[PDB]
Enzyme design. Structure first.
Site, PDB file in Angstrom:
ATOM      1  N   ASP B 127     -24.583  65.860  -2.172  1.00 13.09           N
ATOM      2  CA  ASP B 127     -24.140  64.669  -1.703  1.00 13.09           C
ATOM      3  C   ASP B 127     -25.168  64.220  -0.746  1.00 13.09           C
ATOM      4  OD1 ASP B 127     -22.769  62.534  -0.768  1.00 13.09           O
ATOM      5  OD2 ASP B 127     -21.043  63.465   0.015  1.00 13.09           O
ATOM      6  N   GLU B 163     -24.722  55.128   2.929  1.00 10.74           N
ATOM      7  CA  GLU B 163     -23.530  55.287   2.112  1.00 10.74           C
ATOM      8  C   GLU B 163     -22.369  55.839   2.877  1.00 10.74           C
ATOM      9  OE1 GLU B 163     -22.110  58.707   0.771  1.00 10.74           O
ATOM     10  OE2 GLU B 163     -20.550  57.523  -0.076  1.00 10.74           O
ATOM     11  N   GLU B 164     -22.615  56.834   3.665  1.00  8.52           N
ATOM     12  CA  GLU B 164     -21.516  57.559   4.223  1.00  8.52           C
ATOM     13  C   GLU B 164     -20.979  56.892   5.449  1.00  8.52           C
ATOM     14  OE1 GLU B 164     -20.186  60.744   3.554  1.00  8.52           O
ATOM     15  OE2 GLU B 164     -21.128  60.976   1.611  1.00  8.52           O
ATOM     16  N   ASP B 210     -24.296  60.623  -8.005  1.00  6.78           N
ATOM     17  CA  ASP B 210     -23.642  61.036  -6.806  1.00  6.78           C
ATOM     18  C   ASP B 210     -22.881  62.290  -7.131  1.00  6.78           C
ATOM     19  OD1 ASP B 210     -23.021  61.070  -4.351  1.00  6.78           O
ATOM     20  OD2 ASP B 210     -21.477  59.413  -4.437  1.00  6.78           O
ATOM     21  N   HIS B 292     -18.094  67.509   1.310  1.00  5.97           N
ATOM     22  CA  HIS B 292     -17.957  67.274   2.732  1.00  5.97           C
ATOM     23  C   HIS B 292     -17.502  68.491   3.547  1.00  5.97           C
ATOM     24  CE1 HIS B 292     -17.737  62.633   2.097  1.00  5.97           C
ATOM     25  NE2 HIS B 292     -18.908  63.109   1.736  1.00  5.97           N
TER      26      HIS B 292
HETATM   27  C1  LIG Z   1     -11.362  61.280  -5.954  1.00  5.40           C
HETATM   28  C2  LIG Z   1     -10.201  60.511  -5.286  1.00  5.40           C
HETATM   29  O1  LIG Z   1      -9.041  60.822  -5.593  1.00  5.40           O
HETATM   30  N1  LIG Z   1     -10.405  59.419  -4.310  1.00  5.40           N
HETATM   31  C3  LIG Z   1      -9.292  58.605  -3.521  1.00  5.40           C
HETATM   32  C4  LIG Z   1      -9.937  58.760  -2.036  1.00  5.40           C
HETATM   33  C5  LIG Z   1     -11.285  58.522  -2.146  1.00  5.40           C
HETATM   34  O2  LIG Z   1     -12.276  59.271  -1.420  1.00  5.40           O
HETATM   35  C6  LIG Z   1     -12.123  59.644  -0.073  1.00  5.40           C
HETATM   36  C7  LIG Z   1     -10.912  59.997   0.447  1.00  5.40           C
HETATM   37  C8  LIG Z   1     -10.835  60.385   1.813  1.00  5.40           C
HETATM   38  C9  LIG Z   1     -11.992  60.443   2.613  1.00  5.40           C
HETATM   39  C10 LIG Z   1     -13.215  60.127   2.100  1.00  5.40           C
HETATM   40  C11 LIG Z   1     -13.286  59.724   0.753  1.00  5.40           C
HETATM   41  C12 LIG Z   1     -14.699  59.416   0.510  1.00  5.40           C
HETATM   42  C13 LIG Z   1     -15.160  59.019  -0.699  1.00  5.40           C
HETATM   43  C14 LIG Z   1     -16.583  59.319  -1.156  1.00  5.40           C
HETATM   44  C15 LIG Z   1     -17.043  58.698  -2.332  1.00  5.40           C
HETATM   45  C16 LIG Z   1     -18.278  58.974  -2.699  1.00  5.40           C
HETATM   46  C17 LIG Z   1     -19.098  59.880  -1.916  1.00  5.40           C
HETATM   47  N2  LIG Z   1     -20.299  60.300  -2.084  1.00  5.40           N
HETATM   48  C18 LIG Z   1     -20.624  61.121  -1.070  1.00  5.40           C
HETATM   49  N3  LIG Z   1     -19.710  61.338  -0.207  1.00  5.40           N
HETATM   50  C19 LIG Z   1     -18.726  60.519  -0.778  1.00  5.40           C
HETATM   51  C20 LIG Z   1     -17.414  60.189  -0.440  1.00  5.40           C
HETATM   52  C21 LIG Z   1     -15.413  59.624   1.771  1.00  5.40           C
HETATM   53  O3  LIG Z   1     -16.567  59.473   1.994  1.00  5.40           O
HETATM   54  N4  LIG Z   1     -14.540  60.088   2.779  1.00  5.40           N
HETATM   55  C22 LIG Z   1     -11.547  58.873  -3.796  1.00  5.40           C
END
Ligand code: A1D5C
Ligand code: A1D5C
Ligand code: A1D5C
Ligand code: A1D5C
Ligand code: A1D5C
Ligand code: A1D5C
EC number: 2.3.2.5
Lengths: 323, 323, 323, 323, 323
Positions: B127, B163-164, B210, B292
């Site tokens: 990531d 992104e993050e 990703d 994460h």
């Molecule tokens: C797979 C799924 O069910 N879902 C619903 C929630 C959402 O994702 C999150 C939920 C809670 C906290 C989160 C993130 C989240 C998503 C995410 C997406 C792409 C990423 N690439 C790298 N880190 C990344 C982080 C993030 O950064 N912090 C996707």
């Protein structure tokens, strides 16, 4: 903004033993739940009604009479709706409000507004009285173990109001109680005197119960930041089973089946999720068959499945808290 | 307008015969990549950190050193956050900046921000350090056939920053880099002097990598305007296996299974997808188990899998580009 | 958080001596500026048509030919309008780009679009040809005095595009050009490499000119953060009169009158106000008579007032810049 | 696009001579208005009340008895309010609706809801029952001339429902009827079968009458797009007094003084102004002493003022329409 | 709905006699203000600075030592800024919280954050150190008379925090403390138990003091549901002059003069005004010279202008509250 708001991310459980687990299963009573905690709530109780106050009242009574020092607050507020300004009231019950970190359990205690039909009334037996009782019964069972709070972590229950839409489901007309409570909590330094940390920082994990009480529930793992906690419920379910402590329950019919979910249910968690609170959303997919019908009554509840989710959740929660 | 920007809708690939498939396989070295491309990216590298800068210039030296005429750009910019205005530097590397159309591949070069725990640091291997490398190694590995670009179509890479979330996932606090670069391309004419067509009109397809690098990924077919290219990633994985060109690979553990997805993932494509760019989101569902957490380290990366995905992607790019 | 941005709230002009005031008065030639600075602009020049380029060109040709080292930039860009996407091109001219801080003089270089009525063609001599001219000339005049710049601050001009509206003055259809650029600069580290200071913190003040060139004008004082520069302009209109340098000019018929206004007028300054820049809006109240009528031409311009502002200006500048 | 939507800025009035100006003054009866058009409207008439109904019908019977070919149109609609949904009904009276362009005169015919105080009822005599009666009277005074409408231009009268707030003047509790009808016309092709032009492009000008009736009014000049037209009322005011046709009127106490204003007045024009309509907003500043007091009744009207304004307006109007 | 929310359109004052008007003017001490109410507060006190706490500390102390039964509420909240999350704290002094209706006086007790420039520190003297003192004196002058309060109406004082923007005035950066309390109030039912009425209903009128201490202020009349109450200021002013109980006081330069303003100044009322509260915006226009410059100090204050307003004000309050 110190570092304590990230301890959540490394919190680990204090797994219990067969002997403890046995004590936990025997220490909860689904029939005292049924009478003392749940039968009082099966009444019409939409926002502002007299029901809302009777049930609001029932709840605090049941909490007020237990040994642990529960700091009940009522969070009455006003909001527009499609029928005009109405008055809602959330119930929050905290142990150690000064504790910086809390694990939260939440449901909603309103009932959806419906007009009566063939002289029956909607009362939301699974939406969400059982959840309410579950929580109330969990404080009642775990009371003696919950005095031990005099890691800086404690427990909060929340009973939201106006979860349900008044007329026609949409952002403007739903989740009135929560954020509110969200937005309110987001903007209230924690601990006190803090300077950059909100009460949401201190929300370790928010366990939302909703739509519980039908037979053969299946709860999905909705979110990745809580999957590990969802996996602890899988493990608890499995252990309580292997020791013989669940009732009419087979593994080919587990409740916590590992199955990612695509979309999102809207429920009281969305105001806290989109503020980066981790959510364990114990709402079943599919909803019960009796959803939003006058048949969401008591006749159609499964006492076995609730006793079972009660054991699991009580266990989940004492392991979370290292008790 | 013109008729050029619908060409994306009809582009067929130039499919490779077994004999070229074998050369392409032969031609990428996962051991090279690991050492020369990826290992240097395994550092704390959040926006405006020294890691960030380290990481940023490294990318560029790996592209600078190749014979194709890549055109780096640093689109550095400023944006408000939960901790103040900060600074962010995208990276874009184009071949044929004037080529009307472009196949774009992208990933993200930041690392989430984490305090240090037990002396441990978050480096984000999946990531998205691995996808950053995979993209480097693609260009090393393909340099010679890329040079053949002195159908008006060429290749772009993008390493997004920010992104993050800094604090807590949210449309305000995430995807800094792409939200920026999306609007900026929506707002840039192209090709120079055109009067009704922007850079985003000449994103033929956006291939976003990703959370790649873990054992047993599975990638859904997320969008229909891009399904047919997923079908090609499927016919490529198949044939490369049916030829013994993948390692430790069985078809009962395909990477691309024809399972459609329900909900949606927020990632650095959103800002391009709601502006009408076709997306092939190569993010796996479920997420890596280590997502994460501090365990998202090199120890926990499946080198066999990455090497297999390097080959699939390298083939895809070539059959798209008719190389 | 360094403090370079707050310097603008401590900046006091090098008030000029009468001797100097004479020279400056003698240095600007309302008939050269009429000759060449402006009569080229008097064309049909809505964004995109032939006129728009010509005028763009003209503007540059004339700044290029001055001995101060003016850096020009075309900022072409795309935006949605009521007829589709269309292309626009701002014009930025700077000295000492690095000149961290800046005094900025802006006006708008397009012409509203109209069909040909009677066989007449709009041209917006007051909106904003003259303001353009008046800025050119101000260059052609103080040229030798600018060269000085190789507190650190310098002078930037700007000639926004599509201020006027294609159909209905509506926030969506107006200020294409400033709206763009204020976003742009609001996200651009200044100086190069800064980590929390955008190019807007570098604008000390914005002087926008619009609707200038008709007879007997009044300019209200709308913005507190900029009175004191207004004041300077009363005085600079006062003194220069009491020394007879001002043609056809009476002190009962002043320009910079004591007369706070109440509301706002929407103009290219809105994007830069919103974000908290200081503005000296030199638009008059009321508008000229010929406003958005085919009568807005040369015929109707009063050589005397123009020159007489063209002078209060060239002073005010020099006094801002301690020159 | 076509050219006709631009006619409204080239359109000139046909001025009236001294004799035709008499023939207009001599042509309206302040007493026929008072007794027959205005006294019926001096009832409690908040939206949905029985007075709203009685008023609607009065306004339509008064317009039905005129010879000219008015088309009436009750555009009844639903809209959320602080008490829930409530119905509103706008009245639209139109000559030659095919006619592409229209000068549009408008007021509001609701009264503000209050609760009886002192056994007193709010009837809103300046707010705005008198503007309503002004428009019916013109309709009468000018009938025979309007009947000439069997440039492409005609006239429409609009009486809005629910201008006023039910609880608190707030963007979402006010202007129910014009937020509505604006939005509606903005999206009705006009003329029929057209393809790029909305009923609102047909609005040459919207003359909105409001808060008329008290003595000694001053109307400021509000909108540069309509100042030319506010000048034509100043002229009419002047000439009618030069000729002796205005009663109790001193060129000191003129009504249309050229003192421009600053901020905005929220009122049924906002919906139409922000969608780029040119507006003549006849509303006094300051507001009658009796505003939103129970004292805003017939006793505190001034007959001479209304008659004088009646004569100005009819003239303007006739001049606008070239009659 | 009820009726008391309307009681405010009907309230009239208990006008005082010349004999009584004398006591009050003697009952204020401009000096035992200065040394004991105002001097403590001229300190750097931007939000969260150790000055803020002192100030907040001081104010409280002073109100606390008065006989009236004031109820202080410190309402510490959290909010986002262009430096991150900061902790504000509004001060809310109230008599008879239950007192359904309340006349409210308010200023902002923060000081805008400035670095330190040439060793000078911005204390804001007229912005709004003086206002708070005025408010504090006012409660020390009328204290005895306020005791009367054990028509249902009493007094509330609000010193906001966070009025001042941190970087560059803007919606999102400014009025931290009143935006927040406006909404906190719009959603708290009042009086307790109510069902459809918000604590903002119970706000009879809001008197906002801002920018008070320079000599020769000209307060305009911004809003008409208050105009009537502004005219009570003129009549108190005038009258206290006719007995020259004032000082350096002219009528060629009275403070409250019949000069409506165009539009609006953004300050702590917007949040209340836009929910339909009534505002007496006692902000002069134009702002002082020493406005947002380090010379807004104790040395450019006009002892006499203040002792006068202090008298005008103090009266008005007794007349509103029938004391
Ligand atoms: C797979 C799924 O069910 N879902 C619903 C929630 C959402 O994702 C999150 C939920 C809670 C906290 C989160 C993130 C989240 C998503 C995410 C997406 C792409 C990423 N690439 C790298 N880190 C990344 C982080 C993030 O950064 N912090 C996707
Ligand atoms: C079976 C399933 O997986 N889903 C997704 C969300 C839900 O959405 C709805 C769709 C249409 C009308 C609806 C709702 C809906 C959702 C909902 C969500 C949580 C609830 N908890 C209690 N009642 C609640 C009501 C509601 O109240 N009215 C059904
Ligand atoms: C089934 C599914 O998983 N999804 C998620 C994506 C979404 O659809 C799109 C994705 C990308 C580009 C798209 C569209 C899309 C959707 C769509 C939906 C319904 C339609 N009915 C007819 N054409 C229609 C077009 C469209 O028009 N352009 C449906
Ligand atoms: C209340 C108030 O002060 N105002 C400003 C004028 C009016 O604005 C308009 C209203 C209706 C149509 C309009 C415009 C308008 C305003 C405007 C503002 C700045 C300009 N600079 C050059 N032409 C320019 C044109 C325009 O172009 N078309 C409202
Ligand atoms: C800056 C300025 O000149 N202002 C501020 C807004 C505006 O008017 C109001 C201010 C505060 C509360 C208000 C109204 C207001 C205005 C208004 C406008 C036209 C009306 N026609 C009939 N009743 C009507 C009521 C209303 O109903 N409640 C005057
Ligand atoms: C009302 C109006 O038209 N304007 C134009 C400028 C704007 O004022 C500012 C411009 C730039 C930075 C600013 C402020 C500004 C205005 C303002 C209004 C009320 C105040 N009370 C105390 N300081 C106070 C400051 C402020 O606080 N910071 C007011």
């Amino acid at each position: 903004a110190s570092a304590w708001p990230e301890e959540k991310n490394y919190h680990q459980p204090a797994i219990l033993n067969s002997s403890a687990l046995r004590q936990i299963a025997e220490g909860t009573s689904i029939s005292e739940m049924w009478q003392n905690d749940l039968q009082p709530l099966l009444i019409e109780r939409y926002p502002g009604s007299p029901g809302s106050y009777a049930a609001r009242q029932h709840i605090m009574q049941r909490i007020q009479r237990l040994q642990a020092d529960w700091v009940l607050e009522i969070d009455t507020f006003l909001s527009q709706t499609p029928y005009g300004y109405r008055s809602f009231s959330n119930i929050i019950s905290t142990l150690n409000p000064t504790a910086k970190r809390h694990l939260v359990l939440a449901c909603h205690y309103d009932s959806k507004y419906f007009s009566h039909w063939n002289n029956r009334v909607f009362v939301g037996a699974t939406d969400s009285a059982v959840p309410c009782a579950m929580m109330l019964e969990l404080a009642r069972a775990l009371d003696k173990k919950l005095l031990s709070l005099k890691p800086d972590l404690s427990l909060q229950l929340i009973f939201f109001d106006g979860e349900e839409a008044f007329l026609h489901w949409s952002p403007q007309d739903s989740l009135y109680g929560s954020r509110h409570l969200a937005a309110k909590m987001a903007s209230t330094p924690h601990p006190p005197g803090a300077r950059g940390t909100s009460q949401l920082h201190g929300m370790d994990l928010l366990v939302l119960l909703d739509l519980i009480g039908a037979p053969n529930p299946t709860f999905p793992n909705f979110f990745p930041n809580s999957a590990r906690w969802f996996e602890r419920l899988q493990a608890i379910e499995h252990e309580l089973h292997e020791l013989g402590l669940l009732k009419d329950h087979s593994l080919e019919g587990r409740y916590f089946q590992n199955y990612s979910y695509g979309g999102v249910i809207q429920d009281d968690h969305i105001p806290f999720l989109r503020r980066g609170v981790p959510v364990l959303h114990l709402i079943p997919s599919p909803f019960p068959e009796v959803w939003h019908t006058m048949d969401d009554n008591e006749e159609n509840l499964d006492e076995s499945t609730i006793d079972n989710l009660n054991k699991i959740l009580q266990v989940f929660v004492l392991e979370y808290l290292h008790l």
